[PDB]
Amino acid sequence: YYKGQTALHIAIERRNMTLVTLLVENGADVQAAANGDFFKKTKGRPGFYFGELPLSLAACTNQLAIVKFLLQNSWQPADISARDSVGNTVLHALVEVADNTVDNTKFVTSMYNEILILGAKLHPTLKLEEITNRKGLTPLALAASSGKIGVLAYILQREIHEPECRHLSRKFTEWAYGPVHSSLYDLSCIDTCEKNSVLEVIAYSSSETPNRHDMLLVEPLNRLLQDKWDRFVKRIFYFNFFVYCLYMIIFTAAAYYRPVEGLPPYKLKNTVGDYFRVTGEILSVSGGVYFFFRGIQYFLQRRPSLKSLFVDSYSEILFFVQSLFMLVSVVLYFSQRKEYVASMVFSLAMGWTNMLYYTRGFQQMGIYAVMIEKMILRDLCRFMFVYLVFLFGFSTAVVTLIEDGKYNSLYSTCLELFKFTIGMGDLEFTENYDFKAVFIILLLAYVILTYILLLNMLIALMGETVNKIAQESKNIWKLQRAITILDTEKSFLKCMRKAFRSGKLLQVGFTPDGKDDYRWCFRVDEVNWTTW
Template sequence: MHPGKCAENPPKSQNREERSGHGRKGEPQPLETPYQKESSEFAPKIKINLNYRPGLVSNQKDPNRFDRERLFSAVVRGSPEALQGLLEYLRRNSKFLTNSEYTDAKTGKTCLMKALLNLKNGRNDTIPVLLEIDQKTQNPRPLVNVSCSDCFYRGQTALHIAIEKRSLEMVKLLVENGADVHARAHGEFFRKKKEGVYFYFGELPLSLAACTNQLDVVDYLLNNPHQKARLQEQDTQGNTVLHALVMIADDTEENTKFVSTTYVEILKAGVKLDPTCKLEEIVNYDGLNPLQLAAKTGKVEIFRHIIQREIKEPVYRHLSRKFTEWTYGPIHVSLYDLSSLDSFEENSVLEILAYSSDTPNRYKMVVLEPLNKLLQQKWETFASKRFYFSFVSYLSFMIIFTAIAYYQPLRPSFPVEFTAGGFLWVSGLIIILLGGIYLIFAQVGGSLVGGESVTSSYFLSSFIQAFSLLLSAVLYGASSENYVAVMVFSLLLGWVNTLYYTRGFQRTGIYSVMIQKTIMRDLLRFLSVYMIFLFGFAAGEPSVSWLWLTVCFPPSPGDPDGHAMYGGLLSVSLELFKITIGMGDLDFQEHARFRYFVMLLLLLFVILTYILLLNMLIALMSETVTDISGYSKSVWKLQVRPKTLTVRGGSACLSLAQILMWFLQRVVILAVHFWVYLQLSVDSEINPEGKLNHEERSAVFFELLWQQNFRQAPEQHHL
């Protein structure tokens, strides 16, 4: 090329998507295909020929010239004879096999990768020749470690391709020539995505060999004399080879067999290489070890294998998580390793299963041993007592709230008369106000330290209930009658939230779950479609709506022309809703201007809603109930588990409950003392002559109150 001469630009007709190597809809183009040649559309570059001599320019092509087409054709055929003269040509022109002119412009694929992608019976005789030539040219970028450069296959090296082609011979050859055994293939094709084409294997060559069931390659990579692969190595997501095995598990019989076998073999290899290394305790960037990752992703079979793994060989027995202690016939007594399972650890399996409602197959995992026995013992030991105590306390709170709402005057009557009724009314107000404050703190505290999601239905309803309660108290104190609606709404939510405590009983707990699932899954979808039909038939654009012009109500007496008047959008919607539930009256269309047209529309509305949508809702609800009934016991276990697992994070809420109970006890004792105050004037021992006046009786009353109740508060009740 002449000095200063630029390479030709790519054709302008080529669009950007094709130049970047993308397939349709963002999918990658094949790395190797016999139906398409490699791309030559490189970005423009300026090259200078320092050996340029004007008088020596010749238009004849060099017969010994090696271009990419000639080189790639030779490696595809597997013909080392066709590569004769390549070394001399590269030396003569100061070129290397890794130069851009010998690679694919889109993917960065080299001639070595091309050769590995075209193996015949696991061999390609041009590969040793290419490696030898690259070493003799003293390439600063060794051909064996050059990786693909496009966004989809970025990071993939020749070693990855050799492992994917299941050729142990080629793997050995590449490692002997300096291949990096820790190269990461981190392109988009190798990342786990919700949709699209991808193959996630852990990015590392060792992980690829393990995930493709090549134990011989795994053994060689770990024990070769050139560069040993490290089992602790992590990919760009922090996953090790064990994490990768969990990720590719799919719960099928064949897959589970090879994944479980490879998992155990890697653990054994880790003991041989480094006995102090604990591979299963390495966490990824999400804070999950392989066991926790299996629980989070719902991989039931590999999860079962890990928690019930038992190795009989004495050398590796410490790798077991299950130890059979005693057997007698069908009876087995076993010890289990509870590390990463119990709730005292961060991101424990129990917390993942209990609080992550989006975890698949969690109903199947919670009944596996030792989780089943562990949860049962936690429930029977302490959680059930705390749960029932919380239920009784909440029920008492709602009864007091209901009584106060029933007997509360429309406007505040302050100051309150110093009578038994006034005292009880004020005490009830204080209790429900403290209860509202406690509910807010309990829900926020539970979401922060207990793992409860702020988007859960119980959290939202309880928070709204408590907020409405406090808001009604503020409105009541401001003498606003609007407090009634807010208080009634809070009272209604409070009794609905009582369903939360039905989870403590198996029969009612399952029923409560069915109601919740039906509302969240089926009823919301039905309502979204129904509202479209309802308002679509009821209105439209006011200027052109057929209902605006036709659906009317009887003429008003003051109308001199006797024309029917439109009743309004909400009125028409209400009439249509009545028709949907079978309580409507079709006679309201008799006064319409276009009677028969309206009748046709009403019949169409009845067919679409009353016949179609309602029956679809019933069918969907039946399917939901049947689905839940199939694993009803597991569903009930998961309903009571959040209460079982609040030992680590529930201390603050427990202290608040203790304070509330302490206050309730003081209120009860205060009521007793108030009754004593009322009896001082007639008590024969304290006031034998009945001569104590109001001030003297008050002094005796407060002295008794101070001595028995408020001299000192228990230390264990402070936060």
């Protein structure tokens, strides 16, 4: 299944410069593609992806001299913009082959720089990076989507120190006075592009992305997010928090003063209190419907994978569940049923406990809520299955021992046994049985076992994470804030392009073509006393 393989590829692989020159002397083709299954992305665990072109194979295989020879041969010039069947060019292959390792990262960035420089020199009139594959992803977009931290870090901080190619670089130095110099970063296709932006791609990427958390440590991204926040998202978020708090207060007041006559609905009397109760109930139902509709809209827009449904979107799912409880409550209320009380109280508790979603926006409280989320996700089930097994087993044993009476039911005995965990056990809660020794032994064994269980719980989740929580929680909180910022920006387009990324700047003034250019720079200031 090696169809499409050519001897030129084999020669290039063997690092044989002279043999490659001899092979291409007769006029060996260079645009031939290897469509064999062995050269595909992931069809079968064995394989190797190299872009399906000989020049891409040379580029990805640590042969810069061969790349130069292929690009600047006098026999048959090698096309640099050629797009393979999957639409991936040299840059796409370089992005793919990276594994986010220091040595490999340095290799890939060096090769990317060299190939970009050669392409610019050969055909300066042709824009290279802006191109897209069949998937419609730019090389920067592809790197961001695949989580290649090194490639993205290099691209966002490109700096070329030789003439006639400064326009390629994304970082420029406006000036340098004394030990302090200002720097400019290019924000083209970063925040808003209407097709795919780096911030949008990184934000909405699934957790399967290797390094989604720390990719925001990049300097321009972090500073841009902070600036956007402090510019307008802080005010918008605070207003939203205030509105939601008013909603929750109104809902609590309406629910607390519910009438007690039975068989709803209830006719409203001509009194001020009844009017206030009715308007509060209407507002609560309206808010519930609004939350339900927003949740449905989000679910259609994003379409989670049903596997990361909980790890990602942990707050939207909870809000949607609260809204569902509200809708069930109203449906039962109009159906002349008295279970709307149960549904309403569940919704009310969920709503009050969902106020933690707004902790993000304050560093400490945000980290606290993030830790709560992480536990509820990845520890609760594992550390609760064991405890429930123990509790159920010992409760079944005790209830089997008991002859008859109030506690002969399994549920009551389970409740009494669970009372030991909250510091209210009895050890003498019944006497209708035989063999008091067996009863006492069972209860003491249960107590000792559950205490041992909790002790290894805490030992485990303290030892395995006392170090990661130092910065991992902060990184997750920063990601959370980024999600909030992007959602707030996209949702509130009513204010047009209010509070744009930055001002308009002229960094180079002239490109190789006579026409001038601007790159929507983002001014940044730093100081470096040493290494002038």
